[PDB]
Amino acid sequence: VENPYENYRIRKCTLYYYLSDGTIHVNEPKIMNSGIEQGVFIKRQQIPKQLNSTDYYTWEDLNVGININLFERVFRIVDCDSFTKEFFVYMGKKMNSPERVP
Amino acid sequence: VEINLFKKYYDRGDLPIAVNFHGAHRKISWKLEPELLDYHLYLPIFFEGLRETEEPYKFLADQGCEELLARGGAKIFAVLPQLIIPIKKALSTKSHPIMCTTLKKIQKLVTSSDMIGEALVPYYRQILPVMNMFKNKRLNIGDHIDYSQRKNENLSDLIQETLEILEKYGGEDAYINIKYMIPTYESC
Amino acid sequence: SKKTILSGFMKNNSIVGFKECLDSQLQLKDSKSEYNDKFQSKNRIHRDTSIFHIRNKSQII
Amino acid sequence: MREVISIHVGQGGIQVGNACWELFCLEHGIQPDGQMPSDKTIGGGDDAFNTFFSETGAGKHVPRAVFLDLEPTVIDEVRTGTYRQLFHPEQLISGKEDAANNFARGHYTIGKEIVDLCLDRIRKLADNCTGLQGFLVFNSVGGGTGSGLGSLLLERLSVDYGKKSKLGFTIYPSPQVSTAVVEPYNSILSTHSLLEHTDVAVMLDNEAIYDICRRNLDIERPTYTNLNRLIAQVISSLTASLRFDGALNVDITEFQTNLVPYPRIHFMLSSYAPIISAEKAYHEQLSVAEITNSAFEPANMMAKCDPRHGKYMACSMMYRGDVVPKDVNASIATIKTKRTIQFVDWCPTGFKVGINYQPPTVVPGGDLAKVMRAVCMISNSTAIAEVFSRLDHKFDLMYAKRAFVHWYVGEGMEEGEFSEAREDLAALEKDYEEVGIET
Amino acid sequence: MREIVHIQGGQCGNQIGAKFWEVISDEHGIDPTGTYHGDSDLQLERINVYYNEATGGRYVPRAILMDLEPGTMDSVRAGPFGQLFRPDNFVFGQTGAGNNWAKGHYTEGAELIDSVLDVVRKEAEGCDCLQGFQITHSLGGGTGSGMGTLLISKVREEYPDRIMETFSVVPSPKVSDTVVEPYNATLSVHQLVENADECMVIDNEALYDICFRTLKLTTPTYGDLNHLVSAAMSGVTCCLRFPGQLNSDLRKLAVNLIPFPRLHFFMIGFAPLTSRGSQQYRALTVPELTQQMFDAKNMMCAADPRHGRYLTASALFRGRMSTKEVDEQMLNVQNKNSSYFVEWIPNNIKSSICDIPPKGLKMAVTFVGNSTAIQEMFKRVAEQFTAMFRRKAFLHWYTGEGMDEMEFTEAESNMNDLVSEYQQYQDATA
Numbered sequence A: 001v002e003n004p005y006e007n008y009r010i011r012k013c014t015l016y017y018y019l020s021d022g023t024i025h026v027n028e029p030k031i032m033n034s035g036i037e038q039g040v041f042i043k044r045q046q047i048p049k050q051l052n053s054t055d056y057y058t059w060e061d062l063n064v065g066i067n068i069n070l071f072e073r074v075f076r077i078v079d080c081d082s083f084t085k086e087f088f089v090y091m092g093k094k095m096n097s098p099e100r101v102p
Numbered sequence B: 001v002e003i004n005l006f007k008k009y010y011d012r013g014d015l016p017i018a019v020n021f022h023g024a025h026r027k028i029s030w031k032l033e034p035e036l037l038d039y040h041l042y043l044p045i046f047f048e049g050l051r052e053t054e055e056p057y058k059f060l061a062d063q064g065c066e067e068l069l070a071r072g073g074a075k076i077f078a079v080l081p082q083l084i085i086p087i088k089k090a091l092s093t094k095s096h097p098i099m100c101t102t103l104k105k106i107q108k109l110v111t112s113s114d115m116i117g118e119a120l121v122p123y124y125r126q127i128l129p130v131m132n133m134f135k136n137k138r139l140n141i142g143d144h145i146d147y148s149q150r151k152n153e154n155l156s157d158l159i160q161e162t163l164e165i166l167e168k169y170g171g172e173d174a175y176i177n178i179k180y181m182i183p184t185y186e187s188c
Numbered sequence C: 001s002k003k004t005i006l007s008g009f010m011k012n013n014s015i016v017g018f019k020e021c022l023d024s025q026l027q028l029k030d031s032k033s034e035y036n037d038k039f040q041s042k043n044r045i046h047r048d049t050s051i052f053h054i055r056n057k058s059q060i061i
Numbered sequence D: 001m002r003e004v005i006s007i008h009v010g011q012g013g014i015q016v017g018n019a020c021w022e023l024f025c026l027e028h029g030i031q032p033d034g035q036m037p038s039d040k041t042i043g044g045g046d047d048a049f050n051t052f053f054s055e056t057g058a059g060k061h062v063p064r065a066v067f068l069d070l071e072p073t074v075i076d077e078v079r080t081g082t083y084r085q086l087f088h089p090e091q092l093i094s095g096k097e098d099a100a101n102n103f104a105r106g107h108y109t110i111g112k113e114i115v116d117l118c119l120d121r122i123r124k125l126a127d128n129c130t131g132l133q134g135f136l137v138f139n140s141v142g143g144g145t146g147s148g149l150g151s152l153l154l155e156r157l158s159v160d161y162g163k164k165s166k167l168g169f170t171i172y173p174s175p176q177v178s179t180a181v182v183e184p185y186n187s188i189l190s191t192h193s194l195l196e197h198t199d200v201a202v203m204l205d206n207e208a209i210y211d212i213c214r215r216n217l218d219i220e221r222p223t224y225t226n227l228n229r230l231i232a233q234v235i236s237s238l239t240a241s242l243r244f245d246g247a248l249n250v251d252i253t254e255f256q257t258n259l260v261p262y263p264r265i266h267f268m269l270s271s272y273a274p275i276i277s278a279e280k281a282y283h284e285q286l287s288v289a290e291i292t293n294s295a296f297e298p299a300n301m302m303a304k305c306d307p308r309h310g311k312y313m314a315c316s317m318m319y320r321g322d323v324v325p326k327d328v329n330a331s332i333a334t335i336k337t338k339r340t341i342q343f344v345d346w347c348p349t350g351f352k353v354g355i356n357y358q359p360p361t362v363v364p365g366g367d368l369a370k371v372m373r374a375v376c377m378i379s380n381s382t383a384i385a386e387v388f389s390r391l392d393h394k395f396d397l398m399y400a401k402r403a404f405v406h407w408y409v410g411e412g413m414e415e416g417e418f419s420e421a422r423e424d425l426a427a428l429e430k431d432y433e434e435v436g437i438e439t
Numbered sequence E: 001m002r003e004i005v006h007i008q009g010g011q012c013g014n015q016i017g018a019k020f021w022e023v024i025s026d027e028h029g030i031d032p033t034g035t036y037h038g039d040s041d042l043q044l045e046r047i048n049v050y051y052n053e054a055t056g057g058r059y060v061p062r063a064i065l066m067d068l069e070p071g072t073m074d075s076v077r078a079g080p081f082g083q084l085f086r087p088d089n090f091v092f093g094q095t096g097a098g099n100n101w102a103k104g105h106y107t108e109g110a111e112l113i114d115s116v117l118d119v120v121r122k123e124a125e126g127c128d129c130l131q132g133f134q135i136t137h138s139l140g141g142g143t144g145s146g147m148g149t150l151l152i153s154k155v156r157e158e159y160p161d162r163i164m165e166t167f168s169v170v171p172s173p174k175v176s177d178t179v180v181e182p183y184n185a186t187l188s189v190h191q192l193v194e195n196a197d198e199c200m201v202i203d204n205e206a207l208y209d210i211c212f213r214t215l216k217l218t219t220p221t222y223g224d225l226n227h228l229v230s231a232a233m234s235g236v237t238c239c240l241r242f243p244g245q246l247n248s249d250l251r252k253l254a255v256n257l258i259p260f261p262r263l264h265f266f267m268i269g270f271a272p273l274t275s276r277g278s279q280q281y282r283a284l285t286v287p288e289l290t291q292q293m294f295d296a297k298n299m300m301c302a303a304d305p306r307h308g309r310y311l312t313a314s315a316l317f318r319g320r321m322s323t324k325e326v327d328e329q330m331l332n333v334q335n336k337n338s339s340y341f342v343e344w345i346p347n348n349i350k351s352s353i354c355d356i357p358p359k360g361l362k363m364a365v366t367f368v369g370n371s372t373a374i375q376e377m378f379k380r381v382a383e384q385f386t387a388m389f390r391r392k393a394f395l396h397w398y399t400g401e402g403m404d405e406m407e408f409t410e411a412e413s414n415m416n417d418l419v420s421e422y423q424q425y426q427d428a429t430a
């Protein structure tokens, strides 16, 4: 609101999904001259679909170009690692066309 | 401690005290006079000896400690901080004659030299709680005379007198400190 | 796939017995309090005097 | 041209004041918005509201009440309630910090900063009044702010106005049921404060009304609102003669001429009848004789005291309904006849009787039903000394070794004030014992 | 109005807050982004007690996070609801305390505390009407037991008339995780007794016992234990945020519970607690609420309450309920157990009612009891402390940082004196 140049900011962060136990990790890389305490955003833990629920995420619930609800926040997944592409084509799960970040 | 400090310091043999009493009841003669004596090395031991329960150590320590307090002079002020632990533990020994004797010793300490009450004021927390429990306890014989005040074992009256004399010398903050520590105390 | 999906990430970071309590005990409306049960009812100049005497043994609670 | 001013202090005072003000509005036909409806009129005559309300010139009315508190929770709740449009919104005085059951806090630390505003409001309200009858003051005694503020207000008023009559409707702590642990201290201090400053005090403890609600209303899980409704009905029965036509009217000034034999003894205990539900009330006669017998039945006393343990000094009792003076006199004859009720020797007759024509009103959604005849009785009797004795013993147990005393010492009150209240209650006990002996 | 700020330090207190804050947020309907999505209008009326307003309409907890090692706070930030905290209030060191009370109270903490003192001063000055402060810490750890205690002393020096609250997790001798626990526990309690206005003691061992016996759950965890502590904390101040028959704030509890200034160590408990299987079958009534209130196994402490006599008890109820049955049950509990209640305080129970239930419960109860049963806790702590100190074991690390053994001796003397004075009123008779 008070920033003269900007009215809406964009935070970029990377997502890891461990295949050993289905746990999820989120962290945002540091950017110079940002003035934001940037580091780990979500600990290594399972994340339920909704708050106060026991229904967790699985690997088939993740895709590119989609919105994901993490603790009432809505992330937009825009791009995926190359290794994930081979993993998903091996498992038989299709992907959509990845775009670039606004 | 397994063995009393005054015991292992008397069989030590370096005491300048010797009873050798030829008088009314008892007395003690000293091979060293106090102005040569160093109080730092001795007064903590003498106050420690008050805890002892078996003869002749009680009488020896009592007489030595009281005469040190009487004729020490200004030197008592310097050795004040070290004396707090023995007087606390002797009071905690919860024995009635030991409390009576140490109670008299505290009185004579406070009245012995000037400018010591204020220095002792920070230290009520160590010494008052033991007196707190037994302030309430007292004898109620009724109408009859009590013949026993010749010697002083009435713990309630003695502690009340000690609080009075203590407050008379402590200063302004002494009253609030002692009221904080013991609730039933009453202003004088 | 019975008890060896287990690991340190998943097991400790999962609350066990203190998640949402079971239903049929959730049923209170937080906004609805006293002085509003009665003093915030409505009030009316003329009361409704109709009273019913059911032929049923009154339930005990 | 006759009016009274109502003062509420403490959370209990507010929770009984709102209850009685609902009853007053329903009885006078005033909508909760404060406006009398253009149509649908239920109240004949004029200036009937003038006892408790004052005309704004065109339309609604404002009550002659003031609310005092130091904790804003209940004040905010009432200002958010449906009676928001009714009260003047700057006579609901609210503080910032609660006294937290500490009488010293409410009498010496934070009440002194609110007392000036309260007295200014009192002067402003009294200036409108022209035929001021007196003040009613409501406060639960087992609370720090209630007790301290009540004491301070009575102290200021007794010197500001002088001879104006004041009535304190105190709720003393129950014999063994209690909500707090420090309440004996502030109760004793407050009674010492108000003894030499209140003209009439009413006993309103909790166990008695609890047992009344259990036995008669057949309610096993009652709440404070039903209690407050009972006290509200008592207030209405007390003051209905002041503003409503009757065969034998009784004024508030006609209490300090009938019920206080000596200046010291001005604590009275009440009773009210009938207490019966609409599922139950309609099979009996509800006749004057049986209702006045239930009135003097000892288990129906409004306060937990046994009248059989002492003599009766005076009894002022008011009927409202279609009662007949012959019937009332016949019933008083039987009451004087009966065995277990005996009066003090130097009082040949001890009854004051009042009669009022219109029956008491009922609150919708309440507990009570509608009856022609209701009796509200106020008695001064020698039996009241037992509560003073037991609270004295409870105070003694804690003061024996000076427990809880430093939280009162640290708020500016000296040490010796407690013993002043102690000796005052001892003197009161000796006074009761001395008066109670025959000649 | 009459609001409370939050200050927590050490990894233990950080984990405590890491649950307490989303407990409060779920009670008040606050989303992890700080935007209100609640249902009841009462959820915002007293929102000023714990939350400050920011531009854009969001709310921020008024919590101050301190630690001498940054890993714990960097982990709690990634936790759920971790973004609520303002990044300004985080204060952390770069060295760590090494579980060393001397190093966390003399060398590093004294230097570091300037910034956290400035920020807490700013927070206290900002609020309209300060009621008091609350701290959560464990006495088995160096940085906690040192910095928290020095902070308590500093804050008390500047705000003598405010409320000071502390939730202390004291080290039990059975489930011990650190060799040097007795030293810092004793040194900490010495300072805490003369500064804290009220302290509530919690044991991990009692937490495990409750989880294993009452809940009958297979895998207890620090999450469950922290949730216990969080519910217990919220129950104390819920009636301050919500209306009731008898609202009772911290000052009222303090007046009604503490007979003498040096006795402000309480034990707490929560009801009801039932297993998942039997949660449906039980029918919530005030009688079972009270019998689980006063049950010995339900208390949050390893101290046995029937080994001593209650100085006083206090209960805070949540939910719509009639007062007659409440106080009648209280009277019945007194008449049935007169032997455990001290005789020179008649009617030594306070009862308070709050109309708003916790999220999802028909009725709830928080109990706080001051009794003589806590003497044995200090007894075993002092026993272990003196067993270690007689040989001067582990003492050089502490004495190499400017403090001497006279401090330990005086701390032990004061600690034992507190034990004796606390035992005194147990045997007092009228």
Ligand SMILES: Nc1nc2c(ncn2[C@@H]2O[C@H](COP(=O)(O)OP(=O)(O)OP(=O)(O)O)[C@@H](O)[C@H]2O)c(=O)[nH]1
Binding pocket: D009, D010, D011, D012, D013, D015, D071, D098, D099, D100, D101, D102, D140, D141, D142, D143, D144, D145, D146, D147, D171, D173, D178, D179, D180, D183, D206, D224, D225, D227, D228, E245, E246
């Ligand atoms: N009859 C009746 N008595 C009440 C009610 N509420 C509180 N009380 C009485 O008030 C006493 C305690 O004082 P409170 O009125 O609750 O509080 P207070 O007088 O404002 O004093 P503080 O608590 O410091 O604010 C209790 O012992 C109750 O007996 C009520 O709704 N009805």
Ligand SMILES: Nc1nc2c(ncn2[C@@H]2O[C@H](COP(=O)(O)OP(=O)(O)O)[C@@H](O)[C@H]2O)c(=O)[nH]1
Binding pocket: E009, E010, E011, E012, E015, E016, E097, E099, E138, E140, E141, E142, E143, E144, E145, E176, E177, E178, E204, E222, E223, E225, E226
């Ligand atoms: N309740 C609870 N206790 C914990 C948790 N983590 C550690 N503890 C306890 O804290 C103690 C160690 O405290 P410590 O880390 O030295 O405190 P610090 O020095 O302030 O960081 C251990 O004995 C544990 O029992 C937790 O997540 N919850």
Ligand SMILES: [Mg+2]
Binding pocket: D011, D071, D098, E247
């Ligand atoms: Mg209050």
